[PDB]
Amino acid sequence: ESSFVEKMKKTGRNIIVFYGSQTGTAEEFANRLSKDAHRYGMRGMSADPEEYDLADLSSLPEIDKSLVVFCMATYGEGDPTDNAQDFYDWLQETDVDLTGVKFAVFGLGNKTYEHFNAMGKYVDQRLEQLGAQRIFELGLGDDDGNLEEDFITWREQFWPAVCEFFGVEASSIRQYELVVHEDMDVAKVYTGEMGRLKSYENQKPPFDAKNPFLAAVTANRKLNQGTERHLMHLELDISDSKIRYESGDHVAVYPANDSALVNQIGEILGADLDVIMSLNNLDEESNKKHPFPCPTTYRTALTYYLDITNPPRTNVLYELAQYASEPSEQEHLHKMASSSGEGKELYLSWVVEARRHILAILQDYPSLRPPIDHLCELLPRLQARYYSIASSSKVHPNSVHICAVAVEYEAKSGRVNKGVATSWLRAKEPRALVPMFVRKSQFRLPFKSTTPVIMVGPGTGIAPFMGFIQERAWLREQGKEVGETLLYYGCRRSDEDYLYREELARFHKDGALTQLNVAFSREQAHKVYVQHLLKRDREHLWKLIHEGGAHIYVCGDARNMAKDVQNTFYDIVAEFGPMEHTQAVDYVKKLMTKGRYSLDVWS
Ligand SMILES: Cc1cc2nc3c(=O)[nH]c(=O)nc-3n(C[C@H](O)[C@H](O)[C@H](O)COP(=O)(O)OP(=O)(O)OC[C@H]3O[C@@H](n4cnc5c(N)ncnc54)[C@H](O)[C@@H]3O)c2cc1C
Ligand SMILES: NC(=O)c1ccc[n+]([C@@H]2O[C@H](COP(=O)([O-])OP(=O)(O)OC[C@H]3O[C@@H](n4cnc5c(N)ncnc54)[C@H](OP(=O)(O)O)[C@@H]3O)[C@@H](O)[C@H]2O)c1
Ligand SMILES: Cc1cc2nc3c(=O)[nH]c(=O)nc-3n(C[C@H](O)[C@H](O)[C@H](O)COP(=O)(O)O)c2cc1C
């Protein structure tokens, strides 16, 4: 009658989503989620928390193999959507014991806001505190970029997880049907292009992401003197493309999977890699006509369109589960999709940590040979790799310069893995082309040259700063007056990986670089980092930042370097403020919204 647990017994439901929308979205999902409830020996209903009193969750253990999904959108200061208000205030003042209740939450938000997903995160952790049994990890949907994905990527893994737990079954269900060709003009077949059919053969402007330019490699060289790593310098020709860049922009390139890696797939798969085929969307009523540009051969798809390198998501292994002859190896592939337990352990342990790519999985689980085409629909799309530009538009504006470290590590899975973009970018011979484009950014130098410039950026992070310390040196030699120009670079040793040593000490000698504070981390007994050298110079630095009106730039790995360095500045703004931490932060805060502090971090 009222207890929404009872309105489920009279209807035969064993699952109920709860939209917490305020402008649509949430409910949209809530439904679409329980409308799938069918395909898996279950059936749900999407209800609104406003009505039925939620305190009735305690009745949920009455229905067998019951579940409850939450789709809460977040508004204002972590404010709970209007209809979720009561459910919210309840979750706080309450103390009821929701033991046995199985759940899962999927919040919607937008990183742009301070309290990002404060609602989805609360209704999530607040249930566990009351004694729930999280069935699947919290879903953090971020509208800012793309929400549908986040959700689709979440539901893509949610169900196989609700199965391995509850017991329900699937039923394959392909998303594309195959169509092979016994003719096709070789000139109406995709062979690596990204958009325009033949835009790689007849390069026609304007050049951007949808239609990349094929820059030629004028020079490729080993920047580091060490031999444990391979840092290189790539120069790409952009002459004849009107592609105008600026120090501080990124240059994205479209890699080609590994020749040997690819071909070595068809072999163990026992498949004809050169059959000009075409995947069609079983839902003619949509944009997504094909997963990748078709018609094309498989070989081309695994080379320019598919990502056969990053470890497969739990769901992809769970859908490839079937194509395993063994009853043992399949059992595994199924478990990986576990929400928790030794299944997830193994997953993170055997797949994500060990770093087993698809070919690796096909060879360690031999009784697993999926039909080629299906696989070429389960794998994700090959992604473009971005790099920070080491050149200056004021200097050679026809050569996009790249500085980047090659990936090639012995993996926990036995074999040695190589980077798709870096391995591919290492073999180019100085006509070798490099599909690419430029991504405009907000990483720029000051308008007025007189403005001081502090640049913190170790290792391959030096990159953007070389572009800078070339445009600054240009301006000097071009009449204009240039303010100070400090640099805080770092590495392991000087006889190992001291990048652009001559190019640098060269600029120091002439003026481009007022100072070249380099922090080696393995020269001496202990460790030395670029945040120590800032602390040391805090004295000077405060004055450049405070009175000088300098701009700051930090660039390199986002993980620890970005964090530790920025910490130091807080310590600096506070010591010489004087002000308490927070105080200090809001100083750097505004500097950010000013353009005097700017991050070009990546990890
Ligand atoms: C805005 C932006 C700018 C960038 N600028 C640069 C730049 O200037 N220079 C540069 O070198 N890179 C830069 N990168 C990183 C670069 O795009 C690639 O990540 C790098 O070239 C690696 O090869 P892939 O490009 O082929 O990477 P992949 O082959 O796809 O491999 C990347 C993955 O390899 C794994 N990996 C790496 N080392 C190990 C290890 N020891 N053990 C286990 N797994 C490991 C990780 O899982 C990592 O996610 C940037 C990224 C962004 C988003
Ligand atoms: N778990 C680990 O063992 C570990 C640790 C750090 C980074 N990494 C990985 O390696 C990548 C680094 O990029 P890269 O190869 O281009 O860098 P890199 O050129 O090899 O190194 C750049 C410089 O940063 C230093 N550094 C490391 N941690 C730092 C910290 N917390 N604060 C300040 N400086 C620090 C390095 O010292 P050292 O080489 O002596 O550490 C080195 O001098 C990261 O993306 C990260 O994912 C892994
Ligand atoms: C006034 C307003 C405030 C918002 N505040 C936040 C917020 O603090 N945190 C967050 O993660 N998202 C915030 N969002 C984004 C929404 O949560 C997101 O767009 C969500 O998809 C809306 O879902 P709905 O259509 O189901 O109501 C806000 C949106 C508006 C219009």
mmCIF file of N, CA, C and O and ligand atoms in Angstrom, residues 229 231 405 458-461 490-492 497 519-522 527-531 557 559-561 564-565 602-603, ligand 2:
data_model
loop_
_atom_site.group_PDB
_atom_site.id
_atom_site.type_symbol
_atom_site.label_atom_id
_atom_site.label_comp_id
_atom_site.label_asym_id
_atom_site.label_seq_id
_atom_site.Cartn_x
_atom_site.Cartn_y
_atom_site.Cartn_z
ATOM 1 N N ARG A 229 67.228 4.760 -19.677
ATOM 2 C CA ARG A 229 66.021 5.372 -20.213
ATOM 3 C C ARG A 229 66.294 5.934 -21.601
ATOM 4 O O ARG A 229 67.449 6.085 -22.011
ATOM 5 N N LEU A 231 65.146 9.225 -23.503
ATOM 6 C CA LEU A 231 64.495 10.514 -23.702
ATOM 7 C C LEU A 231 64.904 10.986 -25.078
ATOM 8 O O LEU A 231 66.076 10.934 -25.428
ATOM 9 N N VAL A 405 59.762 11.041 -23.000
ATOM 10 C CA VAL A 405 60.388 9.803 -22.544
ATOM 11 C C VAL A 405 59.659 8.547 -23.032
ATOM 12 O O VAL A 405 58.438 8.390 -22.852
ATOM 13 N N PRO A 458 60.729 19.605 -13.674
ATOM 14 C CA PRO A 458 61.777 18.597 -13.837
ATOM 15 C C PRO A 458 61.521 17.537 -14.913
ATOM 16 O O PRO A 458 60.407 17.398 -15.407
ATOM 17 N N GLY A 459 62.576 16.796 -15.258
ATOM 18 C CA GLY A 459 62.493 15.734 -16.248
ATOM 19 C C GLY A 459 61.872 16.169 -17.553
ATOM 20 O O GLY A 459 62.128 17.280 -18.009
ATOM 21 N N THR A 460 61.064 15.299 -18.161
ATOM 22 C CA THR A 460 60.400 15.639 -19.419
ATOM 23 C C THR A 460 59.472 16.846 -19.238
ATOM 24 O O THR A 460 58.856 17.304 -20.195
ATOM 25 N N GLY A 461 59.375 17.361 -18.015
ATOM 26 C CA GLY A 461 58.521 18.508 -17.767
ATOM 27 C C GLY A 461 59.171 19.799 -18.213
ATOM 28 O O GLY A 461 58.521 20.830 -18.312
ATOM 29 N N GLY A 490 64.982 19.586 -12.720
ATOM 30 C CA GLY A 490 65.516 18.495 -11.918
ATOM 31 C C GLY A 490 65.682 17.160 -12.638
ATOM 32 O O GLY A 490 65.098 16.929 -13.696
ATOM 33 N N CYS A 491 66.477 16.267 -12.062
ATOM 34 C CA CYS A 491 66.703 14.959 -12.666
ATOM 35 C C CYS A 491 67.440 14.043 -11.701
ATOM 36 O O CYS A 491 67.563 14.351 -10.517
ATOM 37 N N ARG A 492 67.940 12.922 -12.210
ATOM 38 C CA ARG A 492 68.654 11.962 -11.377
ATOM 39 C C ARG A 492 70.150 12.289 -11.250
ATOM 40 O O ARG A 492 70.655 12.473 -10.142
ATOM 41 N N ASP A 497 70.608 11.754 -16.957
ATOM 42 C CA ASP A 497 69.497 12.416 -17.618
ATOM 43 C C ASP A 497 69.335 13.925 -17.415
ATOM 44 O O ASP A 497 68.272 14.391 -16.996
ATOM 45 N N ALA A 519 68.139 20.781 -9.759
ATOM 46 C CA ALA A 519 68.154 19.904 -8.601
ATOM 47 C C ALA A 519 68.329 18.443 -8.973
ATOM 48 O O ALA A 519 67.377 17.804 -9.410
ATOM 49 N N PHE A 520 69.543 17.919 -8.800
ATOM 50 C CA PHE A 520 69.839 16.511 -9.085
ATOM 51 C C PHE A 520 69.351 15.695 -7.905
ATOM 52 O O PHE A 520 69.484 16.129 -6.766
ATOM 53 N N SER A 521 68.814 14.507 -8.148
ATOM 54 C CA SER A 521 68.291 13.737 -7.036
ATOM 55 C C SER A 521 69.112 12.539 -6.655
ATOM 56 O O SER A 521 68.831 11.889 -5.654
ATOM 57 N N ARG A 522 70.127 12.227 -7.441
ATOM 58 C CA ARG A 522 70.925 11.064 -7.109
ATOM 59 C C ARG A 522 72.422 11.315 -7.181
ATOM 60 O O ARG A 522 73.214 10.377 -7.119
ATOM 61 N N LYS A 527 68.442 12.763 -1.346
ATOM 62 C CA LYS A 527 67.669 13.169 -2.505
ATOM 63 C C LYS A 527 67.504 14.677 -2.524
ATOM 64 O O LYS A 527 67.387 15.288 -1.470
ATOM 65 N N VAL A 528 67.496 15.272 -3.718
ATOM 66 C CA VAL A 528 67.294 16.728 -3.879
ATOM 67 C C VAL A 528 66.207 17.010 -4.915
ATOM 68 O O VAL A 528 66.285 16.533 -6.052
ATOM 69 N N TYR A 529 65.206 17.797 -4.534
ATOM 70 C CA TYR A 529 64.114 18.103 -5.451
ATOM 71 C C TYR A 529 63.922 19.596 -5.686
ATOM 72 O O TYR A 529 64.327 20.423 -4.870
ATOM 73 N N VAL A 530 63.297 19.937 -6.806
ATOM 74 C CA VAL A 530 63.078 21.327 -7.163
ATOM 75 C C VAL A 530 62.266 22.138 -6.152
ATOM 76 O O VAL A 530 62.208 23.356 -6.260
ATOM 77 N N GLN A 531 61.627 21.480 -5.186
ATOM 78 C CA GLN A 531 60.853 22.214 -4.174
ATOM 79 C C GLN A 531 61.744 22.645 -3.004
ATOM 80 O O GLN A 531 61.339 23.449 -2.156
ATOM 81 N N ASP A 557 54.929 15.468 -14.079
ATOM 82 C CA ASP A 557 53.971 14.530 -13.470
ATOM 83 C C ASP A 557 53.051 15.258 -12.465
ATOM 84 O O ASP A 557 53.526 16.067 -11.659
ATOM 85 N N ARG A 559 51.107 13.737 -10.072
ATOM 86 C CA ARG A 559 51.117 12.993 -8.814
ATOM 87 C C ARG A 559 51.739 13.648 -7.577
ATOM 88 O O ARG A 559 51.029 14.182 -6.717
ATOM 89 N N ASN A 560 53.061 13.604 -7.483
ATOM 90 C CA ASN A 560 53.732 14.161 -6.325
ATOM 91 C C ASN A 560 54.427 15.484 -6.568
ATOM 92 O O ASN A 560 54.377 16.369 -5.727
ATOM 93 N N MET A 561 55.066 15.636 -7.717
ATOM 94 C CA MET A 561 55.774 16.878 -8.008
ATOM 95 C C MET A 561 54.861 18.106 -7.937
ATOM 96 O O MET A 561 55.138 19.046 -7.187
ATOM 97 N N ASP A 564 53.823 18.722 -4.192
ATOM 98 C CA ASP A 564 54.913 19.180 -3.333
ATOM 99 C C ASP A 564 55.403 20.580 -3.644
ATOM 100 O O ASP A 564 55.672 21.359 -2.731
ATOM 101 N N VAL A 565 55.529 20.906 -4.924
ATOM 102 C CA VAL A 565 55.986 22.235 -5.298
ATOM 103 C C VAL A 565 54.959 23.279 -4.870
ATOM 104 O O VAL A 565 55.289 24.239 -4.176
ATOM 105 N N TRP A 602 50.552 16.311 -15.893
ATOM 106 C CA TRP A 602 50.048 15.072 -16.494
ATOM 107 C C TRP A 602 50.621 13.863 -15.735
ATOM 108 O O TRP A 602 51.717 13.937 -15.174
ATOM 109 N N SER A 603 49.895 12.751 -15.723
ATOM 110 C CA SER A 603 50.377 11.567 -15.014
ATOM 111 C C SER A 603 50.055 10.228 -15.694
ATOM 112 O O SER A 603 50.906 9.308 -15.627
HETATM 113 N N1 LIG B 2 55.732 4.477 -7.332
HETATM 114 C C1 LIG B 2 56.980 4.851 -7.860
HETATM 115 O O1 LIG B 2 58.003 4.207 -7.716
HETATM 116 C C2 LIG B 2 57.013 6.142 -8.654
HETATM 117 C C3 LIG B 2 57.534 7.328 -8.018
HETATM 118 C C4 LIG B 2 57.573 8.537 -8.745
HETATM 119 C C5 LIG B 2 57.120 8.592 -10.053
HETATM 120 N N2 LIG B 2 56.598 7.404 -10.688
HETATM 121 C C6 LIG B 2 56.092 7.390 -12.111
HETATM 122 O O2 LIG B 2 57.042 7.929 -13.064
HETATM 123 C C7 LIG B 2 56.522 9.144 -13.698
HETATM 124 C C8 LIG B 2 57.509 10.260 -13.656
HETATM 125 O O3 LIG B 2 57.747 10.931 -14.877
HETATM 126 P P1 LIG B 2 59.168 10.956 -15.576
HETATM 127 O O4 LIG B 2 59.507 9.538 -15.900
HETATM 128 O O5 LIG B 2 59.205 11.793 -16.817
HETATM 129 O O6 LIG B 2 60.036 11.581 -14.540
HETATM 130 P P2 LIG B 2 61.618 11.639 -14.423
HETATM 131 O O7 LIG B 2 62.199 12.472 -15.509
HETATM 132 O O8 LIG B 2 62.136 10.251 -14.351
HETATM 133 O O9 LIG B 2 61.856 12.341 -13.128
HETATM 134 C C9 LIG B 2 61.694 13.769 -12.947
HETATM 135 C C10 LIG B 2 62.259 14.263 -11.590
HETATM 136 O O10 LIG B 2 61.208 14.321 -10.571
HETATM 137 C C11 LIG B 2 61.775 13.813 -9.371
HETATM 138 N N3 LIG B 2 60.694 13.443 -8.375
HETATM 139 C C12 LIG B 2 60.038 12.246 -8.041
HETATM 140 N N4 LIG B 2 59.073 12.224 -7.049
HETATM 141 C C13 LIG B 2 59.115 13.565 -6.708
HETATM 142 C C14 LIG B 2 58.366 14.320 -5.707
HETATM 143 N N5 LIG B 2 57.468 13.750 -4.926
HETATM 144 N N6 LIG B 2 58.581 15.673 -5.544
HETATM 145 C C15 LIG B 2 59.518 16.376 -6.322
HETATM 146 N N7 LIG B 2 60.280 15.799 -7.279
HETATM 147 C C16 LIG B 2 60.090 14.322 -7.505
HETATM 148 C C17 LIG B 2 62.631 12.645 -9.872
HETATM 149 O O11 LIG B 2 63.463 11.986 -8.874
HETATM 150 P P3 LIG B 2 63.584 10.357 -8.664
HETATM 151 O O12 LIG B 2 63.613 9.675 -10.109
HETATM 152 O O13 LIG B 2 64.916 10.021 -7.859
HETATM 153 O O14 LIG B 2 62.310 9.822 -7.848
HETATM 154 C C18 LIG B 2 63.355 13.348 -11.001
HETATM 155 O O15 LIG B 2 64.509 14.092 -10.567
HETATM 156 C C19 LIG B 2 55.231 9.419 -12.960
HETATM 157 O O16 LIG B 2 54.262 9.586 -13.961
HETATM 158 C C20 LIG B 2 54.813 8.291 -12.039
HETATM 159 O O17 LIG B 2 53.515 7.679 -12.478
HETATM 160 C C21 LIG B 2 56.563 6.221 -9.970
#
